[PDB]
Amino acid sequence: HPNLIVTEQDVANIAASWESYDAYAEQLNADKTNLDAFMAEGVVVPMPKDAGGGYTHEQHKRNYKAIRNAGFLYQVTGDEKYLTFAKDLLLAYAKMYPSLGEHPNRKEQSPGRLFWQSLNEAVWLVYSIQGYDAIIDGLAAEEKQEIESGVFLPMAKFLSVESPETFNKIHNHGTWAVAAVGMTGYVLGNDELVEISLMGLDKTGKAGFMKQLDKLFSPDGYYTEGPYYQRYALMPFIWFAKAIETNEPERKIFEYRNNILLKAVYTTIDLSYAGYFFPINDALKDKGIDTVELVHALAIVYSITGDNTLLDIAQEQGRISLTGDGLKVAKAVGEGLTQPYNYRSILLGDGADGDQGALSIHRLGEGHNHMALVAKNTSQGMGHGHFDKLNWLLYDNGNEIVTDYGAARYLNVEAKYGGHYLAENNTWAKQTIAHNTLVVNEQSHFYGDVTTADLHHPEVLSFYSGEDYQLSSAKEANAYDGVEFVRSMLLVNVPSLEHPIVVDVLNVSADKASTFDLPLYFNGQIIDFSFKVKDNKNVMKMLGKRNGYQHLWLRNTAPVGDASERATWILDDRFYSYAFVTSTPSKKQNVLIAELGANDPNYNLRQQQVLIRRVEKAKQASFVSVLEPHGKYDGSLETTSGAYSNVKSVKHVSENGKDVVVVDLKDGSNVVVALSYNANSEQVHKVNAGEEAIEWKGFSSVVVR
């Protein structure tokens, strides 16, 4: 002891070297200073009372961190006051815990005892067992027995054999529970606790850690619940793996499933822009790469791989793991070994086998010209999944541009329903209308039914990443009865333009005449539109009755027709223009400008604007658009250039199920995008625009004339 997340050898390395690396010493000293301050308050272990973000919730959180940190500092410094504090905290828990029943402020989740839900109980155990592992050799036998019998063994039993609905779950709850119980198993030398954590309660491998590794990650290391829950589950994954490695290296856990755990870490990094995770599915928008799960995970992977590009990410995190692994990161950074991280375009398969749709990330440019297009062609992702098949997000200039709302939830704010998912998470945040994708008849994909959504996934038709352009194309044939839609999204490098442009082609075919809505949630302030808005007559009414529409105010409608239209907005120092046209036999076309906040008596929803393109009574439609960053606004020096869009118009023609899009530019050049939807790279295609003939080879072609 210790022999878990840190080993005796790690402690020796840290003791010998920590003062020699400034980044590590600064981190250690801050943690030490903060703990010393906390210790001055005495041992404070309150009877459990409060929900998420409430006093007892946050106090028991401060305590598990204190136990872990005191154990670490005892080991590194040899200062007995840290042993005493960790010990006395644990003895207080040991006295209290056997008397605890179900938490009094429970909700619909499995209750904890210390906490309103069992999830936080598992986190408490993951942290606290590390502190115990780090002090155990300095305790009297009676103190060990009291702590083990009073809190650790009863909690481990509670979270495993007493909680099969959680322990056997293939879900982030399951990951945390098996990590907590398995790590306890290693520290206490309890073979049974380790075995059930690895192989499930019945030991057959139908549930447990190994099954989670096999099922929750695709072969690309993409975690099916989405980026936000990927980083969260990454801690119990990487920390239980670390414990397995330090105690049973023969299991070769970091080799398992073609280094799935290593791939999970890189993929977590790859799911961020300007340091923030893509807020698809249930997600909070202030979650970034400095989150401790990725700080610790990066350190472990660096220690294994020696990949010096990880040191770039480490510096961007501005935080370092206080482990033996973190020491290696700090040392490498201090020795000037840092290399730039290779942010790249990727296709991430979803489902265990990678075939259940995919998440595409398309990147182009560098610095403030770095654009990222996210194409959400993924399976449901279980309960946290949103009803947004073929959704997209755009990032540019260090900003989110075309956005995903994330979840309706205020992390650890007790006055917001104990920090838990709000009523509006289901009624607004999960719904299709809340997203940048097709809504049919004001109904959500799969009619907002998670059971149905869980059974289906989009079909990826094409992925391409070149220096000329980037493309993803996917088909959704199961979202609605008698409806199929296909979306192709492109990032195009036009040499004459300062920034890459997005081209979007969303085709829908329906058996019955329908309403088709396509929203665009934008970040910024409207400059102007090419269309005239109808007078709202000094009233804003709720947009629709159900499925998220009840949360939107209609601010203006504007009629549109055959010709492409334009909306231009500003965000910080850059302009963005949305040029759009919809090919359809229906003449009933309108733009709806809407604002979030209807049916929100509790002020749970943020202010937000949206441009919705609506076609009514149509069986067929091709929603075509361009998203173009342009120009410079400098409010400091008081200059402006390039403020007008460089796109004169967008035109579209379909022939024999093949599409041609022509983007006419103000300098007289044009961009031609052609889509055949045929994967045969050698098949030649022809489409007649008017008298103009367009010919190409393969699924797609982009030509700048």
Residues belonging to the active site: 229, 384
In single-letter form, the type of residue at position 494 comes to: V
Q: Closest Cα to residue 348, out of 224, 468, 439?
A: 224
The smaller minimum CB distance to a copy of itself, of residues 217 and 273, is found at 273
Contact (CB, 8 A) for 144 and 136: yes
Chain residues in the site for a copy of itself (CB under 8 A): 53, 58, 61-62, 284, 286-288, 290-292, 410-416, 419, 525-529, 533, 535-536, 538-542, 550, 553, 555-556, 568, 570, 593, 595, 597-599, 601-603, 606-607, 609, 633, 635-641, 643-644
* Site membership for Zn ion, residue 551 (CB under 5 A): no
Q: Is 127 annotated as a binding residue?
A: no
Flag whether 230 is marked binding: yes
Show the tokens assigned to 186: 């290693």
At its nearest, how many Å lie between a copy of itself and the CB of residue 176? Answer: 14
471 in a labelled binding site: no
599's contact among a copy of itself, Zn ion, none, with CB below 5 to 8 A by partner kind, is a copy of itself
In angstroms, the CA 486 to CA 505 distance is 8
CB of 435 to Zn ion, least distance (A): 6
Contact 568, 579 (CB under 8 A): no
Piece of 93-101, 196-204, 382-390, 523-531 that binds Zn ion (CB under 5 A): 382-390
Q: Which does 72 bind (CB under 5 to 8 A by kind): a copy of itself, Zn ion, none?
A: none
Q: Residue 42 forms beta bridges with which residues?
A: none
231 is in an annotated binding site: yes
* Number of C-beta neighbours around residue 380 at 10 A: 26
Least gap, CB of 517 to Zn ion (angstroms): 16
In the complex, least distance from residue 228 CB atom to Zn ion, rounded to whole angstroms: 10
In the chain, after which residues is the C-to-N distance over 2.5 Å, breaking the chain? Answer: none
CA angle 636, 640, 641 (to 5 degrees): 140
Is residue 287 a contact residue for Zn ion (CB under 5 A)? no
CB of 629 to a copy of itself, least distance (A): 16
- Residue nearest Zn ion, Cβ-based: 386
The answer to the question of whether 117 is labelled as a binding residue is yes
Rounded Cα–Cα distance for residues 589 and 561 (Å): 6
Rule CB under 5 A: say whether 386 interacts with Zn ion. yes
* Interatomic CA distance for residues 685 and 695, integer angstroms: 6
Select the binding partner of residue 404 from Zn ion, a copy of itself, none (C-beta < 5 to 8 A, by kind): Zn ion
Question: How far is the C-alpha of 394 from the C-alpha of 375, rounded, in Å?
Answer: 9
Cβ atoms within 10 A of the Cβ of 44, count? Answer: 13
Task: Tell me if the bond preceding 495 is cis, omega within 30° of 0.
Answer: no
**Residue 137 marked in a binding site:** no
Residue (104 or 383) nearer to Zn ion, CB:
383
Residue 83 Cβ, how far from a copy of itself at the closest point, in Å?
25
Find the Cα–Cα–Cα–Cα dihedral 378, 384, 387, 393, rounded to 10°: -60
Q: How far is CA 284 from CA 279, 409, 546, 551, in A?
A: 6, 8, 24, 19
672 binding partner (options Zn ion, a copy of itself, none; Cβ < 5 to 8 Å by kind) = none
Q: Is 685 marked as binding a ligand?
A: no
Please choose, out of 86-94, 385-393, 442-450, 530-538, the segment that lies near Zn ion by the rule CB under 5 A.
385-393
Residue 467 contact among Zn ion, a copy of itself, none, beta carbon within 5 to 8 Å by kind: none
SS3 (DSSP) at 675: strand
> Which of 556, 620 has the CB closer to a copy of itself?
556
One residue of 121, 225, 404, 517 binding Zn ion per CB under 5 A: 404
605 assigned ligand-binding residue = no
Nearer to a copy of itself, 221 or 419 (CB): 419
Helix, coil or strand: residue 10: helix
Question: Which string of DSSP letters, residue by residue, matches 263-331?
Answer: HHHHHHHHTEETTEE---SS--TT-BTTSHHHHHHHHHHHHHH--TTHHHHHHHHT---SSHHHHHHHH
CB of 595 to a copy of itself, least distance (A): 7
CB 433 within 8 A of CB 613: no
Q: How far apart are CA 644 and CA 575, in angstroms?
A: 8
Is 118 flagged in the annotation as binding?
yes
Residue 231: C-alpha distances to residues 213, 268, 291, 399 (Å): 15, 6, 8, 21
Closer residue to a copy of itself (CB): 80 or 528 = 528
188 vs 598 by CB, closer to a copy of itself: 598
Nearer to Zn ion, 426 or 586 (CB): 426
Summarize the annotated binding site for Zn(2+) as residue ranges.
Answer: 386, 404, 435
| Interface ranges with Zn ion (CB under 5 A) | 386, 404
Could you tell me which residues are annotated as the binding site? 107, 117-120, 169, 173, 228-231, 386, 404, 409, 435, 638
